[PDB]
UniProtKB/Swiss-Prot annotation:
InterPro entries: Na/Glc_symporter_sf, Na/solute_symporter, Na/solute_symporter_CS, SLC5A5, Sodium:Solute_Symporter_SSF. Sodium:iodide symporter that mediates the transport of iodide into the thyroid gland. Can also mediate the transport of chlorate, thiocynate, nitrate and selenocynate. Belongs to the sodium:solute symporter (SSF) (TC 2.A.21) family. The gene is Slc5a5. Residues 79-103, 235-246, 332-354, 406-409 are cytoplasmic. Keywords: Cell membrane, Cytoplasm, Glycoprotein, Ion transport, Membrane, Metal-binding, Phosphoprotein, Sodium, Sodium transport, Symport, Transmembrane, Transmembrane helix, Transport. It holds the Pfam family SSF. This is Sodium/iodide cotransporter.
Amino acid sequence: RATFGAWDYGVFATMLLVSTGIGLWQLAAVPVGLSLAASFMSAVQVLGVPAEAARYGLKFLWMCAGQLLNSLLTAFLFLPIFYRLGLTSTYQYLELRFSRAVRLCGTLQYLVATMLYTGIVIYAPALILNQVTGLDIWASLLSTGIICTLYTTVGGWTDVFQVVVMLVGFWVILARGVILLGGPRNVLSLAQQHSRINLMDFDPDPRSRYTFWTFIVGGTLVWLSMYGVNQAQVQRYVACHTEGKAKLALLVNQLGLFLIVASAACCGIVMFVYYKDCDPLLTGRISAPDQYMPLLVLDIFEDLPGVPGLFLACAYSGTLSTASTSINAMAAVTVEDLIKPRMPGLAPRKLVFISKGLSFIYGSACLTVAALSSLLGGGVLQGSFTVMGVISGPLLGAFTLGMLLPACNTPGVLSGLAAGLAVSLWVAVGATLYPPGEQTMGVLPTSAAGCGRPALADTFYAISYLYYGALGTLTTMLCGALISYLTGPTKRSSLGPGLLWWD
């Protein structure tokens, strides 16, 4: 109990092996959108969103409000620019706007951000395996790395099946939990009593981790960083045979992500009310809050033996498949965008070998980043939203500056990228060397009676992590706006046909 110990071991092993092996032996656009909702279905979200909802309440539902505002700008301000142009890759726009140097810089920033994000995405299934089997945290990470390598290197329509299965799993967990605790009315009343239904939270204090202001502002930009400029996600919409179909598929992706993040938050609330007494953290039954969901599944499905095995094997294999797909994606991007253009004559024999080698190097780098995440501390959702905000925040800032500011020469945008990246790294490192107090973040009390030294660690490093990506972005523009209009602007009369949004 509390760590498999039944047929669930066999079911987990069988499902993992089958997933690893069997991989390789207007509504037509709906699945494509549902394919990009499979990038936020990773075990990262499974572990994070429920735990964060349980610890901070229902405020986490405002994540959807970020999504609903990131797929509303991505489908009306960023998709037309990337479509009316017509681009093999989105970063090509930069070469059309400022110069090839900015294209290379943006590609490097995307590569770094993706490697860190995939490191976290690989760490999450390692956490699942360690919690489920008690197989250390380093042997578990080793096994996860080996399986991911077998996926990406040796070779590798489940993009929608994995979603469907994990979503029905979330709904099943919700139903079972609510049944155990009586009915929806009792659970809702209990959650309300313990201040878990604090949906309306407008406190302006930026240090407050989760709030309406924080979620809207920070999450919108942290989500544009992942689904508005991300080459892998956006590339699927520059080949939809029409702009309207691309927008419809993007809205379908928005709906899928909204459903995922609402089900996860609701199941997190059910988890909390289930553990309203004898909280695992206070009783030592687990180590980190990200070990909440596996524990919830294991405790709940004691009547049905293998269901935890099936659900967690899906959440593990799907997450590794997503990580391997991302690794292959950036391995291909490196060859097509950075290497091949410089070396024109290489022939395919060496190009395929270089692609495989880059996939291997990226896999190893992501595994090392996962090990670093495990060693450094905890937090999978926070880790993802920090790595993808610190790095991919200034990049979105550069895109927005180039679109909405006609007079943005290359030096201005480059210095804006520098300043934004520096500021984001500054705050993200300050908040890890002097983490904010738990009470100030907004963590709610969890009963168990049933069984900043410097001057910038108290006011600056304490901001919610969601603002990190919104802090670089809002600097990359401002600096890039206060330098472009000083180092000589770019007259709009000679800028390009459709590189702007005002046109």
